[PDB]
Amino acid sequence: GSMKDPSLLRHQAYIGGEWQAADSDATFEVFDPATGESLGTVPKMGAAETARAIEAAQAAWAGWRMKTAKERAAILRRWFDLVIANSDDLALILTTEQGKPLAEAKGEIAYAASFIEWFAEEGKRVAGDTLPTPDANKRIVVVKEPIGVCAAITPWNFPAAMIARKVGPALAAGCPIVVKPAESTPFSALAMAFLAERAGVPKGVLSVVIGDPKAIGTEITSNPIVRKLSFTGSTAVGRLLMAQSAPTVKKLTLELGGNAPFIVFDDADLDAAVEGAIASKYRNNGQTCVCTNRFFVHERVYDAFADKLAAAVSKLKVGRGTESGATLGPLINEAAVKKVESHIADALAKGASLMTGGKRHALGHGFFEPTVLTGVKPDMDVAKEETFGPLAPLFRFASEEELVRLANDTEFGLAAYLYSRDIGRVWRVAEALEYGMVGINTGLISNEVAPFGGVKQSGLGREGSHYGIDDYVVIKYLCVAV
Amino acid sequence: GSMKDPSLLRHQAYIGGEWQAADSDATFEVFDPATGESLGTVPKMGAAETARAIEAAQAAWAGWRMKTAKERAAILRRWFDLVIANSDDLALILTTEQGKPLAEAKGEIAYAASFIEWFAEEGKRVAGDTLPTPDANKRIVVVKEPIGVCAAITPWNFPAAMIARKVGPALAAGCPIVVKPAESTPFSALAMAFLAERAGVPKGVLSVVIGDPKAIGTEITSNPIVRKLSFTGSTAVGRLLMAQSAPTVKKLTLELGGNAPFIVFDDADLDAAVEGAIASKYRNNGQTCVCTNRFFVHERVYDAFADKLAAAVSKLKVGRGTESGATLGPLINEAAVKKVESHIADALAKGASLMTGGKRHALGHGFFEPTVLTGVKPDMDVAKEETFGPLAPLFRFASEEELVRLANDTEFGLAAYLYSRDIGRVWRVAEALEYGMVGINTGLISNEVAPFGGVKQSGLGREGSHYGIDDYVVIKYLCVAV
Amino acid sequence: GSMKDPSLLRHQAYIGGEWQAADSDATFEVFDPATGESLGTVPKMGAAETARAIEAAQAAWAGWRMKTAKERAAILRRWFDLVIANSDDLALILTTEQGKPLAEAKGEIAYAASFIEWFAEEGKRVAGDTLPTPDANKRIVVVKEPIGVCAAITPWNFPAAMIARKVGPALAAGCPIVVKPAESTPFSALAMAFLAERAGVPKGVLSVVIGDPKAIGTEITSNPIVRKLSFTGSTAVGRLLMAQSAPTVKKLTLELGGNAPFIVFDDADLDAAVEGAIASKYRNNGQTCVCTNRFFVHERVYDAFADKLAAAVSKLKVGRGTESGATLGPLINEAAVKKVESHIADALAKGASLMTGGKRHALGHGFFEPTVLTGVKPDMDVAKEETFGPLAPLFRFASEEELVRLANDTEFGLAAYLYSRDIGRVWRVAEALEYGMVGINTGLISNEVAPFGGVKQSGLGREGSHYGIDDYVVIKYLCVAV
Amino acid sequence: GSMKDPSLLRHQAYIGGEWQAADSDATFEVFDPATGESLGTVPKMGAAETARAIEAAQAAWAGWRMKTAKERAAILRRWFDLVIANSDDLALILTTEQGKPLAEAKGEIAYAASFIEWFAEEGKRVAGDTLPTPDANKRIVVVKEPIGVCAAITPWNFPAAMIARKVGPALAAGCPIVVKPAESTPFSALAMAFLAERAGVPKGVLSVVIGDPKAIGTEITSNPIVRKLSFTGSTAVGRLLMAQSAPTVKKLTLELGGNAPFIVFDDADLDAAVEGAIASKYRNNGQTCVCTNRFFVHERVYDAFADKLAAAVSKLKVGRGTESGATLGPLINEAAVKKVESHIADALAKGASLMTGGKRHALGHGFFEPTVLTGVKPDMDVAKEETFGPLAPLFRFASEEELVRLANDTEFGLAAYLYSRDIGRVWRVAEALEYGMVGINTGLISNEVAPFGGVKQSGLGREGSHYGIDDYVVIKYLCVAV
């Protein structure tokens, strides 16, 4: 009702090119995380409807792959344009359902938009090889072709970007895709589906399914038609999805939990590290995959860094995403708040000091006071688990050799940040760090052209860049007798 | 004992760079598939020995990865030369335990060697990117680094080559590897470990563990130290290994089962076709992963191809691998023979016809008569199972639409072969075929410069070429503030 | 004149981002090649004006290269959109000043636009390297940066497309460019430049200089600020420009003359070969760099091919470009008419038989009759020179060995065309052909994704594809102590 | 004389696979630059002898290109294996003919051999692409093939490594090569040619021509058979060869002259910067092309740098190459000595001061005292010209912005060196420097895996790395109708 185009808010799922309600007419409700008020209902679908979405995708494949990359890119770039054109609404829809301040959601829409554009262009560059033959009577030619029907289970913390990142490459490679978005935040996904429809995406090529994650998830992983699956969420769930895809040996991309260390050295520019700490810890209220989970600060600047950070934090305003000056929104749901409190409680019981914040905000719901902790030790839960909230735990380190042992002492290896001004120390530490991504004197590393992903328990594959499309195609060796 | 160097025949496993028997002193016996005799005993190890193997690898990693690509190349190249130098003995050991003729045994050592050399060279070429930044204040640098400790489980059909194909890339990358080879053929695996040891491979970088396939398998898949696992074998086991590797989200390479179509068209050169048929079918007594399973012949040339194939097959000489003039050795075990008999009896029952062979060979043991069958229809078992024996089942087709349907009518998609003279037809059929590898006017396609692997249920990833090494490295994004 | 945007027609040059007359008010006239009428005037500049353009490009470079690839892509994309939006006007200017039919000029405007788009995207993908080091205390990083001020000299046959193919990859790579279009068709370049102003290309980044070919040329080649030059035209002038460019060791793209053989084999589809002949021979009245210069038809199908070619030639309509249905415009000038005459007269004199046309057309001016010749032999002038007109010289041949020798008996090696069905003969002949580009069973091969360029005396470098931007960047190796 | 294999010293040229004296039986003499004592005679050949070597190259091409890359690699690896095994004598030949210390000569042998190895491996990896078509009816296939007959003209500073830098990539590409080495140091070329003959390099594939620089060069550049030319030497000669090659549009690789700045910033590790000064200024007695020509040291560190520099120069023992402890052999000839003295006198005349050296060494001939100069300004000769002698001229600088202007105030741009410890500065400066190669906190940059070459008047193309082979091959685009 508050949009230039209210038909962007959808209360039906998108199955095989058609807008539909659940087969049983079951629906669940979606609430504004800041106010708690109802935003309406969406379908509560399951295995049967997902099966139809998968079949449709299979039936849509031959016609979609038969197009040139240039043609697919004409549709994708039309989709891109529509996303740009409806920027203000898409952002409002997102802010309302997910929480983040309008400025951040407009960032997310432009961010999302750029993945569509990037993969439109990449589609035209998926390239094979002609190679030198080891046998004179033979020639070697290698081509690439879409893998088949793709599926993707996206999370709630970036309800729009996550759709573009997973839809973009599949369609660009010549694949149809079935997407199950997060139950918390389905509107942003459906808003994308609707604009993709307008752009001229053929029926079946794109499906957004909404309902029960075990029912839909189970169908996706057991269905032999689905040849590749992408999942961005918790490490725990990702391990299970790998197990359920094992019977049909699916090609997997897994984007799992992190535990980002953010390292402020002896010789770092302190102010800039503080600028980069606010960005890497407090944007999206600390709920991103890439968010700092552990601060490691050198003895010799610990005291000075902590003050500067405490100051910086106190200039951040908490309030509803639609209010001006507002930079920290609510935590997504009730369970998110209880997690932060748990980490704070564990730290306090183990000897930590509350520098600032530490409790729920008076505005209620998901709002939580930006928190800084000092004297954080590695026996505390925050050393081993992700907070997913606005909490800055500061560990102390003495030596570069101790740091690397500290930073790496974790199951996960997604993002990592490092502030130092010495060229040789930067490399030595960056190289030693078991992480897929490393920010060097920057707190913001995410973009469309760089390969995004983790190592170790943070999963498999890479999204964005020229590396992004690789997982969505499969390779063919042609050995030609001459 | 008929070797220039009798110490190549090993009866102890190679753990952490130490020759050791099982912790409980247990053993199992290896037999000669051609003559039934005893080739000796090897350790029957299990979990605990594999665990020490795995820890040894981790202990060895820091040192091995800190060598330059060139320094690693030196050692691998010495191992190459040592494998070349000891070709005859390696060929004898291989024939003795596996069955294949000496010519094919020597063929494999040569093939195995070229992999070692190839990856030695590739290691010096594993490369990252520098990409144009989307932010003026930042710089994008991409680097590649070893994933971690690797594991490989290899089969018996190529008990030397498979070792080079999986040890080679790992080491080149900068990875240590634990290798559990087939219990039917362990000596080939050990002999190269022995030659690798002499080449200067430091202790812990290579292990060859021998014994209980389930116990050793479970240890490998559940151990968190193992970050990537390669497996070549049956699709049924591949699926389970992917399930078992899930709790740790390991990088998987799977070279699983196939169901190769050999395709003879209207305008094929029949004499060339028959030459390719014999080679793609009767290599290694039909026991390669890429062996023709289903012959599809066009109705115009069906009777002529059948007569020419039948005549050629009947002139092939069956004997023990060491016997000069013999081109067909034994099937590996009793189970293999019975499978071939089952496939024949099945086809015969359903109305097919015997053209040559069909029975077990007078020499007994694993010796089976090279067999050709006409009148084979898609309802017969061999249409859906791999034979892994010297059986040419001739199916029949009329059109180009029909053949694509029939050839792709399987869960598998490894190797396929296509004989036709029309360029337009060649490309058309090569694109429509869902296989990772396609021979065009040839029946021999396997080399070290071409990427080897399948699609669908044939597996994940590629081996050989510049593609082979990518699954042993992990990529790192560096965002550098400017 | 009679266009939606009359201001698209330009009568001033674009020196350093500002529209200017010659320093000395001098001009020269431009005439319609179909009807001889004065189309208006354009400046007659030289060394002085060219030096300001060059000096302007250097002043603009710092601010242009400082933009992200993303940003430059946007500006080029705005230019792309305008080129598409104004497609109809830009066609008529092109037809009016060059002569080719409207359908063809429209086709060229799209071609031209597809190039702007392509390099907009390639600009974002110019990539360097991180390499495995051969000395453990060092690290190798390769990066790529714009070369510097570029210059381009373009021909008259594609006066829209050539501006796109040279301005596109330059600006995309971070490079400024000074252009001198063919003084026979300068409006099409000026129009493009005008739309680039509208797109927001910063003053100095683009310059279109018009006037004395030799003075602008000699100033381009003598000036040390021009670090790279791109030339598309005759081999004669290409050889001179390389020499003039030696004292500053410029980077050179040279797209020179060809002598394209059109090869029709024994077992070809005759009807597709005729379709191929029409498009490769008579499009833009035989005035393209890739236009067939010599037909080689197998003895066995000579008459059959000649008859069908004669029939299809007669089906073409000669007339002015603005008239509907007209498929053949005039030859761009009188000297071009005299070249065609010179070639025909020589063929007859040495024994060739005329089969259609052979003289100038009734419409006068540049109009010449569609011409086919038979009994053509290697002693003829057309065997060694490019006609650049609607002349189809048919040569005879009796074998594969003989064809390769005939097709290669030339100093040139740009485009070549081959019609055959036998997979084995295609590869043998395609490989044996000393040409940069080979069309197989097609007569049209020009597009944005493929590397366009020749070998031998046809020049150096490649335009388009991902190879196209590479000559516009210089590579820097950074050796970094650890 | 005193060499394990006295037949490595050749007094005859190598033409088309046979050792010949000139047609006219003319010769000229080769002296030791440390004693003046005659080392023997070599043929003084001309056009006629070159022309033959070229024709023999054209003849040998087909049979050389026909071999697989692996087959060519086995021949190149035996040549590698013969250079390593005979490195002792080859070093001694090199010292004797050129001057540099025995130990340095050995480093060059191992350096030259590394190139042979690298390209043997690279030849196996020359790759084309398969690209996504913009037209459904067509397929895009790109292959690479050898360019044809290659010529190389090599200088004296590296009489062995330069041979291998040009021959390796050529033979690996599938080309034959005619090499004319420096008239002053021909024995390294000839010894390696001899080894190549023994290695199994087919006759005609490699020729080494000795005689009149002007006569041989002119034949090479005028002959249309020669389709590409690789040159390393002075910029002046480079400009002439590009002019001479213009009538036939030859593909050029030009490694031309430098003007390297070694930059010592405020925050450098001064001891390490000295270790890099010594390594970049006095290696090969200042006679390398990547030699430091201009030292730029910051105001704060100026004094302290100079003191430490002279303090390391005193440890450097000038002596004949065979004497133990000799780290500085003689310059090549009197003309080089006259040049060093020319700069020193001009610098003194304009204000500079002598720190150490400044005179001819007692030993005479072409030995010269290692010289350091303080108070050098831009107005001096050594500021614009290359010394090619042991002369460290120390320039003073204040701001960063100033340094970039001074460092780039030259037409040349091969190597640059940069010492600084601030990550941000290293990147800002290294990006701003107009040079093909920049060394970061190191004086030694040259190796086989990195792209070697310059920008601006320093030439065209790259040597070593995967980029090295690209200039030896040609791109063929195949547009296949399907």
CA angle in degrees (0–180, nearest 5) for A164-A166-A167: 65
Q: How far apart, in whole angstroms, are the C-alpha atoms of residue C15 and residue C50?
A: 8
Measure the CA–CA gap between B213 and B156, rounded to whole angstroms. 13
State the best of D125, D267, D423, D472 to mutate against chain A, taking most chain A CBs within 10 Å: D423
> DSSP state, D26?
-
Which residues, at least 6 apart from B149, have a Cβ–Cβ distance to it below 8 Å?
B54, B57, B58, B61, B175, B176, B177, B178, B225, B226, B227, B228
Bridge partners, residue A439, by sequence: A417, B479
β-pair type (C473-481, B251-255): unpaired
Minimal-distance CA residue of chain C relative to D414: C476
Among A124, A129, A423, select the one facing D128 at the smallest CB separation. Answer: A129
- Give the integer Cα–Cα distance in Å for C194 and C167: 13
Determine whether B18 is an active site residue: no
What is d(CA C180, CA C272) in angstroms, rounded to the nearest whole number? 39
Instruction: Cite the beta strand spans of D323-455 per DSSP E.
Output: 326-328, 353-356, 371-376, 391-397, 415-419, 437-440
Nearest beta carbon to residue D449 from set C131, C251, C451: C131
- Are B81 and B62 in contact by the 8 Å Cβ rule? The answer is no
Q: How far apart are CA D167 and CA D117, in angstroms?
A: 12
What is the rounded distance in angstroms from the CA atom of residue C213 to the CA atom of residue C227? 20
Catalytic position from the list B255, B369, B386, B463: B255
Contacts of residue A315, defined as CB under 8 A and 6 or more positions apart, other chains included, come to none
Determine, for residues A129 and D127 on separate chains, whether the beta-carbon distance falls below 8 Å: yes
CA distances from B379 to B292, B303, B349, B384, B394 (A): 18, 21, 11, 9, 13
D323's CB contacts (< 8 A; 6+ apart) are none
Beta strands in D147-291 (DSSP E): 149-153, 177-180, 206-208, 226-232, 251-255, 260-264
Size of interface A-D (CB pairs under 8 A): 78
CATH topology of domain D260-447: Aldehyde Dehydrogenase; Chain A, domain 2 (3.40.309)
Is-contact A290 A276, C-beta < 8 A?
Answer: no
Instruction: Map tokens 């950074």 to a residue.
Output: C478
Which H or E element spans position D108? Answer: helix D102-123
B215: buried, middle or exposed (CB in 10 Å: 19+, 13-18, 0-12)?
middle
Gyration radius (Cα) of chain C, Å:
23
Do the beta carbons of residue C243 and residue C217 sit within 8 Å? no
Measured N-to-C along each axis, helices C69-85 and C187-199 cross at an angle, to the nearest 10 degrees, of 130
Give D478's strand partners: C438, D141
- Find chain A residues with C-beta within 8 A of C449's C-beta: 124
C-alpha D58/C-alpha D147 separation (Å) is 12
What is C6-256+458-481's CATH number? 3.40.605.10
Token look-up 């003495």 returns A398
Burial zone of B38 (CB within 10 Å; 0-12 exposed, 13-18 middle, 19+ buried): exposed
Question: Do the chains contact at A474 and B455, CB–CB below 8 Å?
Answer: yes
Nearest to A186 by CA among A377, A369, A362, A43: A43
* Pairing of the two strands B371-374 and B353-356: antiparallel
Of A123, A143, A423, the CB nearest to D423: A423
- How many Cβ atoms sit within 10 Å of the Cβ of residue A17? 17
Instruction: Please tell me the distance from the alpha carbon of residue B469 to that of residue B8, in angstroms, as a whole number.
Output: 29
Q: Is D407 left (phi over 0), alpha (psi -120 to 50) or beta?
A: alpha
* Token pair for D117: 């190895």
CA-based nearest residue to A67, from A146, A149, A141: A146
Q: Determine contact, residues C254/C242, Cβ cutoff 8 Å.
A: yes
Compute how many other C-beta atoms are within 10 angstroms of the C-beta atom of residue C405.
12
Compute the CA torsion angle C9, C12, C15, C18 (nearest 10 deg): -80
Pairs from B398-406 (Cβ < 8 Å, separation ≥ 24): B398/B298, B398/B299, B400/B425, B400/B428, B400/B429, B403/B263, B403/B296, B403/B429, B404/B429, B404/B432, B404/B433, B406/B261, B406/B296, B406/B378
CA-based nearest distance A458→chain B, Å: 8
Work out the angle between the directed axes of helices B270-282 and B302-313 (0-180°, nearest 10): 50
Task: Give the residue carrying structure tokens 């040559």.
Answer: B356
Q: Do the Cβ atoms of D131 and A135 come within 8 Å? A: no
Strands (E), D125-246: 130-131, 138-146, 149-153, 177-180, 206-208, 226-232
What tokens were used for B431? 């694109």
Half-sphere exposure in the Cβ direction for A31 (13 Å, CA): 12
Q: Do A68 and D135 touch (CB under 8 A)?
A: yes
CATH number for region B6-256+459-481: 3.40.605.10
Could you list the active site residues of D? 255
Of D121, D139, D427, the CB nearest to B139: D427
Quick check: A371 and A390 in contact, CB under 8 A? yes
C-alpha span between B101 and B94 (Å, rounded): 9
Tokens standing for residue B420: 């036709």
Point out which residues pair with D318 in neighbouring strands.
D328
Positive/negative CA dihedral, A15, A20, A26, A30: positive
CATH 3.40.605.10 location in chain D = 6-256+458-481
Is D365 within 8 Å of D35 (Cβ atoms)?
yes
**D47: enclosing H helix or E strand:** helix D47-66
Residue in C104, C433, C381, C399 with CA at minimum distance from that of residue C260: C433
A66 CB burial (10 A radius; 0-12, 13-18, 19+): exposed
Q: 3-class DSSP state for residue A233?
A: coil
Q: How far is D361 from chain B (nearest CA, A)?
A: 41
CA–CA dist B465, B243 (Å, integer): 28
Structure tokens at D12: 């005859």
Residue where the block lists tokens 């820890």: B55
Q: Are D154 and D189 in contact (CB under 8 A)?
A: yes
Classify strands C455-456 and C138-146 as parallel, antiparallel or unpaired.
unpaired
The residue of chain C nearest to residue B426, with distances taken between CA atoms, is C423
- Test D475 with C453 for CB contact under 8 angstroms: yes
**Strand ranges (DSSP E) for D319-422?**
326-328, 353-356, 371-376, 391-397, 415-419
Tell me which chain C residues have a C-beta less than 8 angstroms from the C-beta of D247. Answer: 239, 243
Give me the total of CB pairs closer than 8 Å, taking one residue from chain B and one from chain C: 81
Among residues A192, A217, A183, A187, which one has the least CA distance to residue A28?
A183
Token pair, residue D447, equals: 């190796």
- As to burial, measured by CB atoms within 10 angstroms (0-12 exposed, 13-18 middle, 19+ buried), residue C399 is exposed
> Which residues neighbour D294 within 8 Å (Cβ) at sequence distance 6 or greater?
D259, D260, D261, D262, D376, D382, D383, D393, D395, D407
- Closest residue in chain C to residue D62, using alpha carbons only: C432
| Subunits adjacent to chain B (3 or more Cβ pairs under 8 Å) | A, C, D
| Rounded CA Rg of chain D | 23
Instruction: Report d(CA C421, CA C268) in Å as an integer.
Output: 6
A-C C-beta contacts closer than 8 Å: 24
Rounded (5°) CA angle C350-C353-C359 = 95
The single-letter DSSP state of residue A469 is G
Q: In terms of Cα–Cα distance, which of D157, D385, D391 is closest to D284?
A: D157
* Number of neighbours of residue D65 by Cβ within 10 angstroms: 15
For chain D, the residues whose C-beta falls within 8 A of a C-beta of chain A are 66-70, 123-136, 141-144, 420-424, 426, 440-441
Provide the token pair at A285. 């209220």
Continuous H helices in A290-422: 299-314, 334-350, 400-408
Burial D451-463 (b: 16+ CB within 10 A, else e): bbbbbbbbbbbbb
- Distance, in angstroms, between B96 CA and closest chain D CA? 31
**Residue A226: helix, strand or coil by DSSP?**
strand
The tokens for C59 are: 């002043």
State the DSSP H helix or E strand holding residue A49, giving kind and residue range, or none if neither.
helix A47-65
A474 contact partners, CB below 8 Å, separation of at least 6: A144, A145, A146, A147, A251, B436, B455
DSSP state of A464: S
Q: Is the dihedral of CA A210, A214, A216, A221 positive or negative?
A: positive
Measure in Å the smallest separation between the Cα of C406 and chain B Cα atoms: 24
Structure tokens at B141: 């640098």
Is A136 within 8 Å of D421 when comparing Cβ atoms?
Answer: no
Of C248, C249, C479, the CB nearest to D445: C479
* Contact (Cβ atoms closer than 8 angstroms) between residue C307 and residue C416: no
Contact indicator for D107, D17 with CB cutoff of 8 Å: no
Dihedral angle, C-alpha B50, B51, B57, B60, nearest 10 °: -130
* Interface of chain B toward chain D, CB-CB under 8 angstroms: 121, 124-125, 139, 423-424, 427-428, 449, 466, 480-482
Please give the distance of CA B79 from its chain centroid, rounded to a whole number.
20
DSSP collapsed to 3 states, chain B:
CCCCCHHHCCCCEEECCEEECCCCCCEEEEECCCCCCEEEEEECECHHHHHHHHHHHHHHHHHHHHCCHHHHHHHHHHHHHHHHHCHHHHHHHHHHHHCCCHHHHHHHHHHHHHHHHHHHHHHCCCCEEEECCCCCCEEEEEEEEECCEEEEECCCCCCCHHHHHHHHHHHHHCCCEEEECCCCCCHHHHHHHHHHHHHCCCCCCEEECCECHHHHHHHHHHCCCEEEEEEECCHHHHHHHHHHCHHHCCEEEEECCCCEEEEECCCCCHHHHHHHHHHHHHHHHHCCCCCEEEEEEECCCHHHHHHHHHHHHCCCCECCCCCCCCCECCCCCHHHHHHHHHHHHHHHHCCCEEEECCCECCCCCCCECCEEEECCCCCCHHHCCCCCCCEEEEEEECCHHHHHHHHCCCCCCCEEEEECCEHHHHHHHHHHCCCCEEEECCCCCCCCCCCECCCHHHEECCECCCCCCHHHEEEEEEEEEC
Question: Would you say A466 and A472 are in contact if contact means Cβ atoms under 8 Å apart?
Answer: no
- Calculate the alpha carbon distances from C134 to A469, B205, B419, B421 in Å: 31, 21, 46, 48
Cβ proximity of D282 and D316 under 8 Å: yes
Tell the residue number behind the tokens 């160097």, with chain if given. B5
CATH number attached to the domain at C261-447: 3.40.309.10
Residue with tokens 């149809």: A176
User: Do D41 and D27 form a contact (C-beta atoms < 8 A)?
Assistant: yes
**Unique residue bearing structure tokens 């213009």:** D246
Chain B: residue nearest C127 by CA? Answer: B131
Solving technique for this entry? X-ray
Give the Å distances, CA to CA, from C448 to A124, A169, C75, C112, C337: 11, 22, 19, 9, 31
Task: Give the integer Cα–Cα distance in Å for A192 and A208.
Answer: 9
- Show residues of chain A in contact with D127, CB under 8 Å: 129-132
Count, residues in chain B: 482
The 8-class DSSP code of residue D324 comes to T
- Helix H or strand E segment including C423: helix C423-432
Q: What span, in angstroms and rounded, lies between the C-alpha atoms of C207 and C210?
A: 10
Facing residue for B427 by CB, picked from D124, D139, D423:
D139
B83, B192 Cβ separation under 8 angstroms: yes
Which value, in Å, is the radius of gyration of the alpha carbons in chain B? 23
| Helix H or strand E encompassing C460 | strand C459-460
**What are the structure tokens assigned to B342, written together?**
């089952």
Phi, psi torsion values for C278, nearest 5 degrees? -55, -50
Domain limits, CATH 3.40.605.10, in chain B: 6-256+459-481
Q: How far apart are CA D375 and CA D352, in angstroms?
A: 5
For B116, the token pair is 């070692």
Q: Cβ–Cβ of B428/D482 closer than 8 Å?
A: yes
**Paired sense of beta strands B128-131 and D177-180, if any:** unpaired
Amino acid at C39: L
Enclosing H/E stretch for D244: helix D235-244
Q: Minimal Cα–Cα distance from D372 to chain A, Å?
A: 29
Neighbours of chain D (3+ CB pairs under 8 A): A, B, C
**Helix, strand, or coil here: A263?**
strand
Nearest to A208 by CA among A178, A183, A174: A178
Distances (CA, A) of A308 to A269, A301, A305, A376: 12, 11, 5, 18
| Listed resolution, Å | 2.7
Q: For D352-384, b where at least 16 C-beta lie within 10 A, e where not — what string?
A: beebbbbeebeeebbbbbbbbbbbbeeebbbbe
Q: How many residues belong to chain A?
A: 482
Residue A146 pairs with which residues in a beta bridge? Answer: A473
Distance CA B464, CA B168 (A): 10
Cα-based torsion angle of the residue sequence C167, C173, C176, C180 in order, rounded to the nearest 10 degrees: -30
Q: What is the CA angle D67-C462-C238, rounded to 5?
A: 105
Q: How far is A298 from chain C (nearest CA, A)?
A: 22
- Per the CB < 8 A criterion, the answer to whether A98 and A33 are in contact is yes
